[PDB]
Amino acid sequence: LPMPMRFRHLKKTSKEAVGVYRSPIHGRGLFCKRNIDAGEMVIEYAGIVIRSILTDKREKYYDSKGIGCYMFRIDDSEVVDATMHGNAARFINHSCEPNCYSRVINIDGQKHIVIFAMRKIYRGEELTYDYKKLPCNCGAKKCRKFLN
Ligand SMILES: Nc1ncnc2c1ncn2[C@@H]1O[C@H](CSCC[C@H](N)C(=O)O)[C@@H](O)[C@H]1O
Numbered sequence: 001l002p003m004p005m006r007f008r009h010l011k012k013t014s015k016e017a018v019g020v021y022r023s024p025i026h027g028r029g030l031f032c033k034r035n036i037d038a039g040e041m042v043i044e045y046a047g048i049v050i051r052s053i054l055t056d057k058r059e060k061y062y063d064s065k066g067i068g069c070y071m072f073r074i075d076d077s078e079v080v081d082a083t084m085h086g087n088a089a090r091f092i093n094h095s096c097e098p099n100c101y102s103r104v105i106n107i108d109g110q111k112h113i114v115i116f117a118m119r120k121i122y123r124g125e126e127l128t129y130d131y132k133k134l135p136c137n138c139g140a141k142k143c144r145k146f147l148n
């Protein structure tokens, strides 16, 4: 199946597939409510695509207001700011042994960051991906110990 078809009803279906709960990794995380097949589109990392140079002053503003800052690093040039116009995907935690991965897809000329299942994921599992001095708490044995 091509990407555009799989993307069309993702907002409707995501509500049924995932939810936000307390995480043993950190704070809140994203968990699945039903088994998810390998290769399945899980959820869009919703938000505003911005040039990376802008993030430090945004984060500074958010912090000064007590607004929780949420951002997805695409690469060294671009970030998705999910602070004001994000969705449940902004709670996805990092793992040193993740079960999802991110991809930037193109829909009618526009960029969307979507999260895909790396393997079959079972009901109840936390969903995690590999983020692109803070220690890591993914709990994996093959763990890199750090976010940096
Ligand atoms: N594996 C991990 N170990 C420690 N902290 C993590 C982590 N994965 C995510 N985090 C924390 O979560 C932030 C990403 S936002 C992810 C949702 C977050 N747990 C929350 O409740 O707000 C990271 O900056 C880090 O502070």
Ligand SMILES: [Zn+2]
Pocket: 095, 096, 135, 136, 137, 138, 139, 140, 143, 144, 145, 146
């Ligand atoms: Zn870790």
